[PDB]
Amino acid sequence: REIVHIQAGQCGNQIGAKFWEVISDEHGIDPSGNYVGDSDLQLERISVYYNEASSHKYVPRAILVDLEPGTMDSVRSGAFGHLFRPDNFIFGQSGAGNNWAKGHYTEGAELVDSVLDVVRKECENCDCLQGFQLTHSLGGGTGSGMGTLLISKVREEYPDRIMNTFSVVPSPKVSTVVEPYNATLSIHQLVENTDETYCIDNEALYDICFRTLKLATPTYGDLNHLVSATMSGVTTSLRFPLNADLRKLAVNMVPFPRLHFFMPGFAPLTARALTVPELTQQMFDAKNMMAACDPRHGRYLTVATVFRGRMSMKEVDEQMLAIQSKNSSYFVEWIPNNVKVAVCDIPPRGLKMSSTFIGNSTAIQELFKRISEQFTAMFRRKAFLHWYTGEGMDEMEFTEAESNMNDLVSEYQQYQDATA
Amino acid sequence: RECISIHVGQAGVQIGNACWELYCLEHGIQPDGQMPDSFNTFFSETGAGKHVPRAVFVDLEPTVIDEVRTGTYRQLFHPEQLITGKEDAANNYARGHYTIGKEIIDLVLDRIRKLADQCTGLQGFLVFHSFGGGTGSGFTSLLMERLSVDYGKKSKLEFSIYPAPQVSTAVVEPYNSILTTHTTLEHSDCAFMVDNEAIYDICRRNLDIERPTYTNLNRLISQIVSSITASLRFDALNVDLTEFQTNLVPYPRIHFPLATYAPVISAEKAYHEQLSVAEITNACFEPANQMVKCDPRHGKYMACCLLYRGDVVPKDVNAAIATIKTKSIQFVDWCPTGFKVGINYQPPTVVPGGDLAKVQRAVCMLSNTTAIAEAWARLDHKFDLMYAKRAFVHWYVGEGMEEGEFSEAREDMAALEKDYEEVG
Amino acid sequence: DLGKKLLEAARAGQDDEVRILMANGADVNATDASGLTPLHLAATYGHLEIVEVLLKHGADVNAIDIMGSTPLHLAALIGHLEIVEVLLKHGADVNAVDTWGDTPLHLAAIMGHLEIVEVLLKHGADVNAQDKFGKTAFDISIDNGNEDLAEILQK
Ligand SMILES: Nc1nc2c(ncn2[C@@H]2O[C@H](COP(=O)(O)OP(=O)(O)OP(=O)(O)O)[C@@H](O)[C@H]2O)c(=O)[nH]1
Ligand SMILES: Nc1nc2c(ncn2[C@@H]2O[C@H](COP(=O)(O)OP(=O)(O)O)[C@@H](O)[C@H]2O)c(=O)[nH]1
Ligand SMILES: CC(C)(C)c1[nH]cnc1/C=c1\[nH]c(=O)/c(=C/c2ccccc2)[nH]c1=O
Numbered sequence: 001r002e003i004v005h006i007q008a009g010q011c012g013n014q015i016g017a018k019f020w021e022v023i024s025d026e027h028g029i030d031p032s033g034n035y036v037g038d039s040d041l042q043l044e045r046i047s048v049y050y051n052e053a054s055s056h057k058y059v060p061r062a063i064l065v066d067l068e069p070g071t072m073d074s075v076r077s078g079a080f081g082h083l084f085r086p087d088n089f090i091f092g093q094s095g096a097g098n099n100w101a102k103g104h105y106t107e108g109a110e111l112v113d114s115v116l117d118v119v120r121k122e123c124e125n126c127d128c129l130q131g132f133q134l135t136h137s138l139g140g141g142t143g144s145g146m147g148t149l150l151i152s153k154v155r156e157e158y159p160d161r162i163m164n165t166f167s168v169v170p171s172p173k174v175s176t177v178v179e180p181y182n183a184t185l186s187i188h189q190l191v192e193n194t195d196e197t198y199c200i201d202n203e204a205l206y207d208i209c210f211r212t213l214k215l216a217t218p219t220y221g222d223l224n225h226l227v228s229a230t231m232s233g234v235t236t237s238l239r240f241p242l243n244a245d246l247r248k249l250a251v252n253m254v255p256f257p258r259l260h261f262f263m264p265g266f267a268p269l270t271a272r273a274l275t276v277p278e279l280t281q282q283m284f285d286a287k288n289m290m291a292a293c294d295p296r297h298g299r300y301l302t303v304a305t306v307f308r309g310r311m312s313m314k315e316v317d318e319q320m321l322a323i324q325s326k327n328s329s330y331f332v333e334w335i336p337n338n339v340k341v342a343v344c345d346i347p348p349r350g351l352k353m354s355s356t357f358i359g360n361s362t363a364i365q366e367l368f369k370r371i372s373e374q375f376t377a378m379f380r381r382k383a384f385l386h387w388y389t390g391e392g393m394d395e396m397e398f399t400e401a402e403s404n405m406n407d408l409v410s411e412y413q414q415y416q417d418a419t420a
Numbered sequence: 421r422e423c424i425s426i427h428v429g430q431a432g433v434q435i436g437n438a439c440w441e442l443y444c445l446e447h448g449i450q451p452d453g454q455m456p457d458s459f460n461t462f463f464s465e466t467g468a469g470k471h472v473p474r475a476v477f478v479d480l481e482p483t484v485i486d487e488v489r490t491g492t493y494r495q496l497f498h499p500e501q502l503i504t505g506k507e508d509a510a511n512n513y514a515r516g517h518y519t520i521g522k523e524i525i526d527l528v529l530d531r532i533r534k535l536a537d538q539c540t541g542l543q544g545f546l547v548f549h550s551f552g553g554g555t556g557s558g559f560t561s562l563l564m565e566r567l568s569v570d571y572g573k574k575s576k577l578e579f580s581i582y583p584a585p586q587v588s589t590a591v592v593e594p595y596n597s598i599l600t601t602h603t604t605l606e607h608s609d610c611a612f613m614v615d616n617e618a619i620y621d622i623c624r625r626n627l628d629i630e631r632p633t634y635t636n637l638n639r640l641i642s643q644i645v646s647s648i649t650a651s652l653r654f655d656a657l658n659v660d661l662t663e664f665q666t667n668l669v670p671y672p673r674i675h676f677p678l679a680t681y682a683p684v685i686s687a688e689k690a691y692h693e694q695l696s697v698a699e700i701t702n703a704c705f706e707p708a709n710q711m712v713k714c715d716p717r718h719g720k721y722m723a724c725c726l727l728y729r730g731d732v733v734p735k736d737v738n739a740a741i742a743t744i745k746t747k748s749i750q751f752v753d754w755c756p757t758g759f760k761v762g763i764n765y766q767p768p769t770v771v772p773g774g775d776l777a778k779v780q781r782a783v784c785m786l787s788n789t790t791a792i793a794e795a796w797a798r799l800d801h802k803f804d805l806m807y808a809k810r811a812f813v814h815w816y817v818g819e820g821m822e823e824g825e826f827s828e829a830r831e832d833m834a835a836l837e838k839d840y841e842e843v844g
Numbered sequence: 845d846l847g848k849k850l851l852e853a854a855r856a857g858q859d860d861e862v863r864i865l866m867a868n869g870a871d872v873n874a875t876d877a878s879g880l881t882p883l884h885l886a887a888t889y890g891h892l893e894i895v896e897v898l899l900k901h902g903a904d905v906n907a908i909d910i911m912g913s914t915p916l917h918l919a920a921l922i923g924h925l926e927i928v929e930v931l932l933k934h935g936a937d938v939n940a941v942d943t944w945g946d947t948p949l950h951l952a953a954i955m956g957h958l959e960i961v962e963v964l965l966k967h968g969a970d971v972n973a974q975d976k977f978g979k980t981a982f983d984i985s986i987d988n989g990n991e992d993l994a995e996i997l998q999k
């Protein structure tokens with residue numbers, strides 16, 4: 001039933017606040033926690049993300065974490081800032097200065113127990129916890145360094161629960177040069193400790209805004225508008241009744257435990273109505289992917305698609321069948337019937353028709369190679385390593401993270417080349 | 421001579437709903453158990469006139485059985501015989517069998533024993549479940565193992581939903597299907613498979629339904645189940661569960677009869693011309709009417725039962741059979757070529773909210789044909805494609821199962837396919 | 845040893861301490877254990893005024909460490925545009941090859957420092973220069989799908 005939501009660092013809290021804004025509107029929750037919606041379907045699965053409080057207020061099951069205090073002021077002055085449980089704000093007074101080691105071993109490690117005290121509290125109020133979703137970036141210090149520490153600690157305490165992340169991958173187009181360090185060290189943790197990771201690539205988000213949406217200077221608000229749309233569609237199947245929970249969806253999406261990094265896509269892409277053939281086509285188009293990878297460069301292990309709005313499911317079945325058969329060589333033949341479809345009658349805000357793509361594709365190795373090449377260029381010159389080793393890190397942690405990263409890349413390629 | 425029906429997982433529960441909905445109508449029982457008795461095999465009677473199904477509904481999550489508890493039949497069943505956990509098997513046989521399923525198995529057996537204790541001569545169980553779900557596969561195999569220990573001399577019959585991609589919600593269903601069949605083969609006496617794709621095509625081609633729902637599929641499935649179990653609920657052939665085994669399973673591992681049903685007519689054709697005994701009999705050897713997609717012309721028959729319902733004269737059945745004998749259905753050389761015949765003279769019933777037209781005559785043919793091995797090969801092939809890369813295996817190994825059980829199950833299946841080839 | 849202190853002052857951006865250390869005779873071309881000079885370090889950590897001070901007093905603009913890195917390699921890697929310009933103005937070898945076969949153009953391309961890429965090209969960066977795996981900067985831009993870099997390199 002219940003999902004516990006944790007958002008860490010500036011990016012994690014910024015895209016997290018936007019998520020809660022979007023799905024509150026979808027469910028008819030106002031900034032004061034009152035239900036003001038029309039459809040009873042808005043409340044059927046309201047308890048997945050909200051606790052029903054005393055005066056019938058609906059309160060997000062959300063925990064807000066950062067080492068920087070100014071992040072909590074920004075979220076709190078948001079439209080739904082005073083809807084979060086005030087005691088669920090856990091903030092230090094230092095900041096990590098984009099230093100993974102500070103988030104993971106020093107400042108963040110001094111704050112993690114406070115976060116776990118609040119996590120424990122929320123989990124105790126749950127009737128049947130599904131698991132956890134985390135929002136964070138991989139390129140800073142708090143979201144990446146402390147976020148992965150939080151992941152491991154939560155994994156130790158609740159090992160029989162699903163851990164999913166929405167993980168923002170850094171890009172020089174939206175950028176310091178130590179971000180490949182932070183992301184590599186974080187990916188190392190995500191490989192071992194999460195069940196599903198949605199790879200939200202700032203390189204892809206910038207490209208979409210700059211080249212498709214023709215936004216000359218994309219802002220974080222421009223990038224996060226695509227993120228809030230992606231997070232809404234990815235969680236639709238859990239907020240509006242299939243008989244499938246987080247675990248059932250992981251079992252169908254993850255054939256091998258390490259390869260749990262998803263390329264998300266969305267159609268239509270708009271800035272601040274398509275037909276079913278147009279939704280199906282754009283959903284699989286490389287230009288609609290939230291990870292900067294070309295799916296035609298790899299092969300799909302598993303694919304899930306979620307259509308939203310009133311449409312012909314007869315037509316959806318037909319369009320989804322042809323995009324497989326006509327592109328048959330891009331879906332691995334040793335996983336039969338590996339593309340699943342669901343439809344939700346309720347469309348997102350501002351649209352009558354939309355669709356969300358979730359791909360477990362071996363082409364995701366292009367994202368990991370891009371990070372690894374940047375990491376290696378820096379690491380070969382040993383630039384700024386004392387910044388990290390001054391917080392107690394050994395240099396072997398860097399080499400081990402690089403190595404595991406390249407191992408993950410080689411695993412993707414092996415299954416990309418596998419035959420039946 | 422009582423029979424207890426057990427429904428496991430989403431598919432088993434929802435098909436159970438349809439079956440008991442049809443049963444009540446066929447016997448004149450209202451949704452509250454009241455009736456303004458041959459059916460005492462399937463319904464107990466309280467000292468107040470209430471007729472209660474001898475039925476258990478089990479699921480590892482509550483929302484499907486919760487609909488039974490609040491729906492039209494909320495007062496039909498024993499409330500304590502509607503049993504739910506909180507966390508389902510996540511399409512994982514290992515969870516249904518080894519970890520989550522064992523949290524509730526003892527409660528389920530104690531509640532079944534409550535029903536059993538009310539029986540003066542229990543014949544055994546009818547178990548309804550999907551192949552593809554984690555509960556339908558895993559918890560069913562666990563329940564069957566336990567039932568064979570605690571009811572050593574009772575018969576156990578299966579109605580099992582064979583998976584189809586058109587309505588499939590799990591890529592791992594081929595795994596669960598093989599795992600459950602391996603661990604159930606020893607414990608099941610006779611198993612009626614229903615291919616969701618076959619029912620799908622019937623609803624599309626015969627009933628004119630573009631996108632069949634689970635409700636459409638399940639009312640059609642309940643019609644075939646009803647024709648199969650009518651002999652137990654009315655007065656000649658297949659009078660007790662053991663007789664199912666005697667008539668349909670001469671070879672104990674080959675216990676998967678093919679069901680074929682006719683006629684299936686859209687409710688929009690209320691004034692259809694009525695088909696004769698000969699015409700509906702002929703329709704039983706048309707692959708379009710089979711519950712499992714396969715080709716009996718390329719198989720051999722080991723046994724064949726014809727169960728008629730309605731305005732059916734025995735001499736017309738005998739003439740229709742004579743045609744069938746002398747016109748390419750081959751029996752094995754070690755069984756009688758004859759066809760067993762049951763006639764239930766009650767007109768077949770249709771649910772008022774159903775998609776079927778009323779018919780004066782219907783027939784369900786049950787034939788043990790080696791041709792159904794084709795359906796095993798299709799599943800096994802899908803199994804082999806994934807297991808060769810060990811895809812999804814880690815989910816099962818992490819939930820109380822050893823990886824060697826995969827290949828142990830697949831080797832059983834290979835031997836089962838060998839059994840079909842040797843007989844054929 | 846004033847050489848060690850000059851190296852640390854140049855790394856930390858201690859502009860006053862750099863001037864005092866040099867006035868006492870500190871070796872402008874001192875090296876640490878791996879062959880980095882004060883100019884390498886000032887260029888790495890973005891300390892432009894110190895880069896210019898060192899160049900004014902005999903720093904070798906093209907000094908290499910044990911790995912073949914020049915100050916321009918490091919400035920192009922970290923992304924200090926003004927420093928890249930100052931080093932090129934004082935004779936930095938635009939096509940210096942390090943022990944991985946990388947030129948400044950390779951490192952600026954890899955790290956997405958597009959303005960620096962344009963500067964290095966204008967000063968004659970070799971678009972055909974191959975790293976030890978045979979990749980040019982254009983190969984890197986196509987292999988990693990960086991369209992903005994690929995059209996810069998094609999001008
Ligand atoms: N004919 C029919 N098939 C169904 C129904 N529900 C599911 N099926 C199929 O059953 C398979 C999925 O198994 P389920 O019965 O839903 O799963 P379960 O037994 O509840 O097990 P878990 O949910 O994994 O714990 C798929 O092949 C479905 O198409 C139904 O109501 N009628
Ligand atoms: N898409 C997106 N990226 C962000 C946002 N805020 C920060 N980032 C990105 O996150 C990374 C920096 O991590 P940050 O969250 O700011 O530092 P932290 O507070 O220590 O976790 C950079 O790659 C930034 O481009 C945001 O609102 N949206
Ligand atoms: C049938 C269908 C399309 C619903 C499906 N089949 C397997 N996977 C999915 C979709 C999802 N699979 C997931 O794993 C998923 C993850 C999720 C959900 C909520 C919150 C965080 C992550 N969200 C999804 O929509």
Ligand SMILES: [Mg+2]
Nearest residue numbers: 098140141142
């Ligand atoms: Mg920070």
Ligand SMILES: [Mg+2]
Nearest residue numbers: 243429430508
């Ligand atoms: Mg279920």
